[PDB]
Amino acid sequence: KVFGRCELAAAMKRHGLDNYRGYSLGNWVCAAKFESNFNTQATNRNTDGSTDYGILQINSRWWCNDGRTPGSRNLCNIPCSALLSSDITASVNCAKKIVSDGNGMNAWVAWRNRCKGTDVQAWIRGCRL
Ligand SMILES: [Cl-]
Ligand SMILES: [Cl-]
Ligand SMILES: [Cl-]
Ligand SMILES: [Cl-]
Ligand SMILES: [Cl-]
Ligand code: NA
């Protein structure tokens, strides 16, 4: 599923991401835009053999099991394929664990390089929330 901007903002708000650990909703929409272009089916392989999955590009090195990342962890206790669903619940619940692990949203490289320090409120401007 390719979300619209305001559609995704409303779904993330219903799932409790607005101001979660102090990160306003626009931060999460901005991260999703540049990580996946709002596409739940996005995948990308990393140099070390791990793979990033879904709308927030969560990494099989630490967070999910895909059966092909030897020596990795599965800290969200899910198969990585669950992060590709049109229902974003699994991705949101795993992202909550990631952002709580000490480094905040710096875990998302695209957030750090393209959203951090910008006017992220623009990403929810005009949306009915
Ligand atoms: Cl857009
Ligand atoms: Cl915001
Ligand atoms: Cl594995
Ligand atoms: Cl949902
Ligand atoms: Cl933080
Ligand atoms: Na893994």
Tell me the CATH number at 52: 1.10.530.10
Is there a domain that residue 20 lies in? yes
Distance of alpha carbon 43 from alpha carbon 56, whole angstroms: 10
Task: Please indicate whether residue 35 is annotated as part of the active site.
Answer: yes
Order of strands across the sheet that contains 51-53? 43-45, 51-53, 58-59
Distance CA 69, CA 49 (A): 6
What is the total count of domains within the chain?
Answer: 1
Contact indicator for 13, 6 with CB cutoff of 8 Å: no
Residue 126 Cα to ligand 1 middle (Å): 13
Q: What is the CA radius of gyration of the chain?
A: 14
The answer as to whether 129 is a domain residue is no
User: Which token pair is 14?
Assistant: 């219903």
One-letter amino acid identity for 125?
R
Q: Considering only CA atoms, which of 40, 122, 112, 127 is closest in space to residue 82?
A: 40
Q: Token pair of 71, please?
A: 């020596």
Query: Locate tokens 């623009």: which residue?
Result: 122
Torsion 82-84-85-87 (CA) sign? positive
Q: Could you confirm whether 7 is annotated as catalytic? A: no
**Measured between alpha carbons, how far is 49 from 70 in angstroms, rounded to an integer?**
9
Q: What is the DSSP letter of 79?
A: B
Q: Which residues are annotated as a binding site for substrate?
A: 101
Q: How was this structure determined?
A: X-ray
